[PDB]
Amino acid sequence: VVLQRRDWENPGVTQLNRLAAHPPFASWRNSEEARTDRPSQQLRSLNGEWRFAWFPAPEAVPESWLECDLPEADTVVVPSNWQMHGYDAPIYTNVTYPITVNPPFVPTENPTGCYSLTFNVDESWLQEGQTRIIFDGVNSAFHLWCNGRWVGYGQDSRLPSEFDLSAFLRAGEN
Amino acid sequence: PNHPLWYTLCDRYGLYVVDEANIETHGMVPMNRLTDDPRWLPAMSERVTRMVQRDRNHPSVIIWSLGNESGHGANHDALYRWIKSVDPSRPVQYEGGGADTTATDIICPMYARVDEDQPFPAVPKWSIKKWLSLPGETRPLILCEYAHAMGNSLGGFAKYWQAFRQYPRLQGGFVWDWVDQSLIKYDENGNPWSAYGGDFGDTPNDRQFCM
Amino acid sequence: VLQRRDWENPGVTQLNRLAAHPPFASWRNSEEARTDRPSQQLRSLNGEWRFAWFPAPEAVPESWLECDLPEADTVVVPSNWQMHGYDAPIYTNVTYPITVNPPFVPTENPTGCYSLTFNVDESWLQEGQTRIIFDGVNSAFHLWCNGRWVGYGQDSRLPSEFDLSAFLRAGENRLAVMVLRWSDGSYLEDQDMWRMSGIFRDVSLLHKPTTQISDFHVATRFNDDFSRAVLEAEVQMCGELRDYLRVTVSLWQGETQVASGTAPFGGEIIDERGGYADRVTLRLNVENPKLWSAEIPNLYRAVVELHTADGTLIEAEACDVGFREVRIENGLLLLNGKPLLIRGVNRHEHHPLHGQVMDEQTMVQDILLMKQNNFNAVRCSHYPNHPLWYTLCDRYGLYVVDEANIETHGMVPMNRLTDDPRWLPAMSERVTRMVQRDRNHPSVIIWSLGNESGHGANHDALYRWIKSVDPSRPVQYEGGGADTTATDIICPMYARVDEDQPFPAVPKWSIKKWLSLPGETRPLILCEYAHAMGNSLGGFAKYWQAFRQYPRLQGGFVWDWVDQSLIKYDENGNPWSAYGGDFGDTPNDRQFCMNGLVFADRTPHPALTEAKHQQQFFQFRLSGQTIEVTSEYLFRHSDNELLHWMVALDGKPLASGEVPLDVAPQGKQLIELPELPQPESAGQLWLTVRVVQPNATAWSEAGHISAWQQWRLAENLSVTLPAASHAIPHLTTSEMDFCIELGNKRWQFNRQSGFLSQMWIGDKKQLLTPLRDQFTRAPLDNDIGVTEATRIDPNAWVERWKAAGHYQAEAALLQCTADTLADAVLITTAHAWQHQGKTLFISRKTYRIDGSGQMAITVDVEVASDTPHPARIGLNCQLAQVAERVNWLGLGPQENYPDRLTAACFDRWDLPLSDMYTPYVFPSENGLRCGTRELNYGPHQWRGDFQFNISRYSQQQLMETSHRHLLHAEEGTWLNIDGFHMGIGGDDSWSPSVSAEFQLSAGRYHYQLVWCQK
C-alpha cells in the first residue's frame, strides 16, 4: 500500500483526504484583530528548519523514515526548492516535456524529497477544535504522515493542500 | 496561481490581475491531446475550481484564465462555463486553439502583430487591427503575451501602443515578460555568475530562452 | 484493497478501466460486419457463475481470491441477487435507502461475490488484446483474475471494461468479482425505483488486434432540402502507426453499396503542435438519402474497415446509420426540418420475475406495444439503457432521450452534490461515458443530464461539454426549475395545462403560460406528465388539445410505461404482485413504484387506450355528410390505411362502408358519405370512423386499428306513449313495510330505513343489501396521494372526505310515505346524512311502480356547499344474482371516467362480468362506464343517463384491501349506479389534481332511473 497504488501515475487520483479549498483563513477569536489584519494565534507558521534527505526514487526511501529522523539527512530551510540546495539539477526546457511523453507514467528514476519536522502543539489545540496543516506549494506531488500514520496525498504544485491533523496529533513532540 | 501574498499586495498597491489555472500541456502532439480527453477533465477541473475558490474575493483579480498553451479541448469549454456560472463578476479568457475560441470572452492572442497577418493553418495570428473586424467578431482584443523582451529586444513596441490608442476595442496586452529566469552559479573563485539552460548539465535544454 | 475504501471515495470512480467507446465486436471478416452476424471475437459469459453473499466486504474470506468457496451456490448471470432471495429489494422514492452521510455508506454493506471458471483458447493470448466487458454492475466492484487484482468500477448503468491480456493463461482461468451494494456512487443513483444490486447486464470477452479501431464517430449533415448529405466518419486507432495503414468506411443500403472512402491515418492540422496522427476523417457523398424517423426508420449500414494499403483486413467494426438532422430553430425542435410532436413515454428497465435484468423478448414486446399505441418516443428514465434497446429503437423507429445515470433526489437541498465541484469528476464520467457509448445511434435525438438533482454548476459544465463534443443533438435537463441555463428545451415534470403551481424558486407554470414568459423562446416538452398511477390519466385529453394548438408545445413523456411490481408467492406457491414494504423493506413508499400504462406482465391498464386515442396521427372533422381527415405525419403518406365508417342507431347497425386513405404528410382528405336511409324508430344516430392498416408492418398485425372518432348525427326524440296496461299495482301496509305487488313481482320498502330493502321475481329475492344512496368511493391513488396514518396530508381528497365524515355519515330518515294512484303506487322518501351535527347530504326520492312492472326512480340530492365535493352521487345495492355477461348501451368497452372517456365509444357492448373489474394491484374504485343509457344484467334492466360499475367486490372491501390478490368475491354482485361521478385526475399523484369542471360542486343534483325486468 502507498507503494502499491502509484497514485502519482494516475490522473484520476489527484488527492486523498484533502480538505475543500477556500479563501484565506486565520481563525481569529477577536473581532478587532480580524479588522486590523493583525497576526492570529490560531495560525502558526512552520517556515523553520526542517530535515531533508534526497532519494532517486520512492522505492529507495527506507521504511524507518516514517518513525525516525534519518541520520543521513541534512537540516535545511523550508520553504525551498531542493535544486537550489544542490541535491539534483534544475532543468530548463521550453516546449518539450522534461520527461518521456507516456501519460500517465513518469520515469522510474523519480527524484524524491523526504522532509520532516519535529514540533510541539499547544495543549488547548488537543482538547477542543480542529487542527489542520496547509502546504501552500509542493512541487509536484506528495504523501503525508503524522507520527508514523498515513494522512493523505496531494497534487497541483501551485495551490494549497490542506489536511485535518486533529485525529493524528498528541501531547508533546509530533 | 501565485503565492497568496501577491494578490494581497496587488489589492493594496493597485494592479489588475489575470489569475491563471495551473494547466499547460504545450509539449503534447497535438497540443489539445489531454485537454480534449474527458479522462483528464477531473484533474483539469480541480486546477480551475480550487483557484476560483481561493482567489474569488480579491478585488485585484479582474479576469480568470483557463491556463496556457494546451490547445483547445472540450474540457476548456466545460470549465469556461463552470466559471461563468459560479462567478459572473469576472470575464473568462483563454488563448489556446487560436485565441478566439468558444472558451474565451476576450480575443487574447500571443504575439499577434499590429499590421502583419501570420496565417498559420488552423491557428492563424491575424493582425490585431484586422482580427477585431473579422465577419461576426464583436469581442475586445487584449494580447495575453506580446513584445517578447528576449535580450536586445522590444523593437516595434511603439507600434503596439499607437494601435491600442487608435482602436477602442484594442485594449492593450501583457508584455512577455517581467524578469529574466537566470540562476546564480559560482566559478572556482566563488564569484557569482548568471546561468541559463544547459548550465546545470540539463539536457535537452532551451538555453537562453529562459531569459 | 480493504485498506483504501474506494467505494467511499467520489474521487475514485474506477481503477484501470479502459476508455469508453461505441459497441464493438472486432469482426475479422467484412461481410460478417456488414450483415451484423455474430463475431467469433466476442464471447458471451452469460452462463452459470458461482455466487456467495456477505453482510460486509470485511467478511469475505481471502481464500475466495484463489479458490472457489464451497458455501457458494450456482446462479444465472446476469442477475440481481435480490431476485434470488439473498437479501431484500428496497422500494423508496425520494428518501435515500442509506443514511445521508457522503461519501460514507453503511458498515453493513451487502457484498456479492461472483466467480467463474472458464476456458481461453491459446490463439486469443498468442497475439492481440483480450478484454472483459461488464455492461452492468450495481453498484461498485473489484475484479480479480487468476488471483491477481485487475481493477475497480462504479456507475451501475454503463459498461466497465478491463484488459485481461497479462492476467489470462491458455486453458483454465478464474474470475473473481466482489460487488458492493452501496458505494459513493449510490449518492448519484437515487432514482425512484427498486434498489437492487448485482451483475445485472451482460458479461463478455472481446478480442481486438494490437493495431485496432479504438473509436469512431458518425455524423450526417444535409443541404437545406435534404436531397444531399455528407456522412462524416472520424476513426481513431491504437497500436503502432504505419504508412501502410488505411481505413475504409463504406455505406450500404441492404446489399447495395452506396458510397465508400479510403484514407491513411493523419488528420488535418489542429493547433501549433500539429494534428492527430492516430486519426482519420472519411467523408462520403450521399445523394437523395433515405431519411430516418420514427415514422419510417430507414437505415444504412456503415462498415469501418482497418486494413493495409495492399488490402489485408486487420479488423472491421460497424453500426446502423440513420440519416437525420435534429435542431432547434426559432424556438421549435425540428427533425429533418419538420416540427416534432412528441408522443412519448418514460420507461424503466423492469421485469417482475427478473428485476432489472433486461431481455430481448421483453424489450421487443415493449416497443411493439408502444408503437401499437401511437407512441413515437421514449425517455431512458433515468440512466443509460441496456445497449440492445438503442439498436431496437434504431430499427423499429422510436425517438430516444438518452439520460445520464445521475439522480440525487434525496439531498437537502436537491443540488447539494451537483453544485459541489468535488462531485464534478464523478458526475462528468456518468455523462461523458454515455455520450461516447451511444453517440452513433440515430434513435437518440436528445441528451439528458440526469434527473432530479436540482440545478448545480456541474450541470452547466456538463451541458457545455456535450454542446462542444456533439452539436448534433439538443441537451435537456429538468432540475432546478426546468428552464435553467443547462437545458435547450423547457422540460418540466407535471406542469399542468392551464393551472399555475407557483412553488417558490421552482414554479411549475401552466405550460401555455410558460412558453410566453418575458424573454422565453425555447420549445416546451414535458419530461414527465400524466402520472399513470392506478386509476389515472384523468385530464389527458387536455394536454393533447394544447399540444395541437400551440406550435411550441411539442408534447411530452408519460410517467410511465410499466408498473414496477415484483412477483411473490403464497403458501400454495401461487404468484402475486408486490410493491413497497412487501419484502420487510422499510422505510418504503408503498404503491408509488406502480405508475405504468401497463401491468408488470405488459397487460394494459385501461389508461393505455386513452393514450392511444389522444396520440392518434389522424385528426377528424365532420361537416354535414363530409368527413375531413388531416394527417399529422411529417414524412410519410398514408399508404397502408383505410377508413372504415359505420352509422348505428342506439347500437343497431344501419349502414357502413370503407374508403382508402390517401393523405400526404400534414395533408387533408375529404370523404363524402353516401345518402343514409332514415330510421323509422326513435333514438340517436351515431357515426364511428376507424383507421385500419390492411397490411402487417414490422410493429403491427394486419387489420390493426390506429385511430378512431365518433359523432352524433340526427336524433329523433321518442314521442310515442307506451302501451297502456290493464293491471294496477297493489299496496300493502304494515308498521315496518310498504309492499307493492304486481303479478309475480314484489317490491318492499322498509319504513324504518326508507329504502327498497327487497325485490322478488316469482318467489326469489333479488337483493342481498338494500338499495341505498352512496356519496363515497373506495379511494383512488390520486385521492390518497402521499398521506399516511402516521403523517396525514390534510389536502388529499381522501383526508378531506374522512375529516368531513363522508365515509361514516349515517342516513337518517325524514320522510317515507306511500300513495295509491290510478295505475301506479308512489313511494316518497327523504333522507339526511349528518356528521357531528352537520348535514352533509339530503336525498329526496320518488319511486313510481306502474301496471307494466316498471319502477321509475327520481332522485334529487342537495350537497352542503361547504363540505368537500363528494366522490359520487348515486345508488348502490348488492344483487342476489351472479350472471355471466354484462350488456350495456353506453361508453365502452373499457373502463372510462368523466375526465378519461374520450377513447370510449358509444355503442352496444357485451362483456363477461370479470372484464367489468379492473385488477389494479392497489385496489380502488374501478370499472366505471359513463354515458350509459341502458344496463342489462341477468333479468334486470336499468335505463336513464348514468355511470355504473358492477362486480363481486364492494366499495368497502376495495378500500379495506391493500392488494388485489387478497380480494375475495362476495356473495352476489355489487352494483353502483351513479347520476354523477367525480373525475379521477392524475396530473400528478401527490396533490389534488381533479380539475374544477370535474368536481361535483353544483350543489343540487338530479337523476332518474327506470328499473324493470325484460
Ligand SMILES: CC(C)S[C@@H]1O[C@H](CO)[C@H](O)[C@H](O)[C@H]1O
Ligand atoms: C515556438 C516557441 C518558441 S513557443 C514560445 O516560446 C517562448 C519562449 O520564451 C514563450 O514561452 C512563449 O509563450 C511561447 O509561445
Ligand SMILES: CC(C)S[C@@H]1O[C@H](CO)[C@H](O)[C@H](O)[C@H]1O
Ligand atoms: C413529491 C414526490 C411525490 S416526487 C415525484 O414522485 C413520483 C412518484 O412516482 C415520481 O418519481 C416523480 O418523478 C417525482 O417527481
Ligand SMILES: [Mg+2]
Ligand atoms: Mg495522480
Ligand SMILES: [Mg+2]
Ligand atoms: Mg469511489
Ligand SMILES: [Mg+2]
Ligand atoms: Mg426522484
Ligand code: NA
Ligand atoms: Na484601445
Ligand code: NA
Ligand atoms: Na521563455
Ligand code: NA
Ligand atoms: Na405543438
Ligand code: NA
Ligand atoms: Na414512482
Ligand code: NA
Ligand atoms: Na385499497
